[PDB]
């Protein structure tokens with residue numbers, strides 16, 4: 001009874017941000033999220049422009065941009081609107097509710113002002129979501145909960161993962177899905193986004209582990225692949241993004257039938 | 258066989274940052290860490306100056322400072338040196354090793370350039386520590402692992418806490434202790450720092466829970482209390498800090514005998 005992305009976009013309990021995403025995934029035939037892991041704003045923006053047609057989402061770590069300004073993020077939004085992708089700041093909030101609300105709204109980055117999506121760890125308990133919600137709901141944003149991680153020795157397993165799923169399903173006005181390595185919720189209104197993806201087997205020297213798009217999307221049932229170095233370190237990042245897009249999209253189609 | 262802070266400062270396996278901290282705790286009769294949870298640099302610096310003699314440590318969330326600059330942090334270091342306290346950025350790193358290394362060294366905040374101590378969640382597995390280490394060891398810094406949290410619904414319990422302790426004890430060249438609600442390691446070379454502290458019973462409306470200094474230091478065996486709103490929201494923050502200092506110090510003395 002698996003639904004297409006475009007059908008999921010219409011489910012009664014779908015969140016607006018999720019629906020927007022699912023619609024553009026279907027329209028553009030992309031379930032690829034670019035992990036734009038660069039330190040220069042010019043490179044971020046050149047990647048966003050060139051790769052925007054190939055991606056459903058651009059994931060940022062704003063806190064590694066050497067030359068962050070709010071104006072950079074304005075320019076990123078312009079590209080996101082032109083090419084039709086969401087912006088996801090991978091801030092992995094992980095503090096008490098009262099603190100994360102301030103980290104999301106304020107400081108230099110003003111994350112909530114430009115990020116369609118953010119994510120949070122579940123370790124602090126559900127107050128992390130309640131604090132983020134206080135900023136994100138008025139700003140019409142969505143959140144992903146980190147249910148599983150791709151790295152060696154991850155403790156996001158077993159009952160921890162189950163707790164993340166319960167927390168999501170209990171905060172569905174704001175939580176739209178997961179960071180996970182597999183489908184973790186049986187409810188089709190939730191998105192599953194999976195980092196630790198490369199075409200070739202391997203890892204890095206600091207605990208990253210890779211699996212292929214066919215494995216992640218096809219066998220493990222996730223929705224979206226998140227790819228950083230497999231694209232960013234390639235000479236031709238546009239062709240690399242196309243290879244990843246095509247892999248993830250066909251794995252999705254084949255799982256649909 | 259409990260040792261004073263000054264004796265612990267001399268233990269064979271003590272980390273230099275821990276030893277510096279323990280020595281100034283003993284000298285100044287303070288085991289209070291101010292959680293300087295403000296949005297204005299001028300208020301941060303005025304608090305650091307006035308309260309510096311009463312504290313062993315000043316904990317920051319740089320990402321909530323509306324007017325952060327590196328020069329602000331230079332001024333904070335001047336105060337830290339004058340009054341003798343460490344600076345602890347409560348960044349709660351919580352990503353793969355390759356990413357946290359960049360979040361610690363780079364971006365706008367350049368955390369490693371000014372923070373004596375940072376902290377990390379253990380959820381990603383030990384690569385989080387290995388990545389931070391690559392920046393922190395050359396810069397002669399230390400790290401705290403988040404073994405327990407103060408908030409309602411925290412998943413940092415049981416085997417998760419035990420995993421944090423094992424990860425610390427296995428990375429003792431860089432990890433100097435814990436964020437925890439109690440003593441979690443039996444090894445006296447590790448520091449235990451405990452947030453969720455107020456003199457009166459209560460909590461906040463976003464899952465924070467409070468326990469008293471006597472409970473945390475005396476009964477639960479921690480070393481340092483971390484106090485935010487119990488001080489910052491008071492009219493006279495200097496007298497509030499003194500009340501917390503005296504409470505935490507006497508609880509420590511009484512546990513020594």
Ligand SMILES: O=c1ccn([C@@H]2O[C@H](COP(=O)(O)O)[C@@H](O)[C@H]2O)c(=O)[nH]1
Pocket residue numbers: 035037061090148149150151179195196197208226227228229230352353356
């Ligand atoms: O479980 C997780 C959570 C987050 N990321 C993020 O996803 C990207 C993976 O990049 P790469 O390994 O494809 O370069 C990085 O930004 C990393 O911080 C993971 O890899 N794994």
Ligand SMILES: O=c1ccn([C@@H]2O[C@H](COP(=O)(O)O)[C@@H](O)[C@H]2O)c(=O)[nH]1
Pocket residue numbers: 095096099292294318347405406407408436452453454465483484485486487
């Ligand atoms: O388990 C944790 C970890 C971190 N903090 C931090 O400690 C401070 C507690 O402040 P307050 O509740 O005393 O104001 C805040 O900065 C908060 O982010 C906690 O409260 N509990």
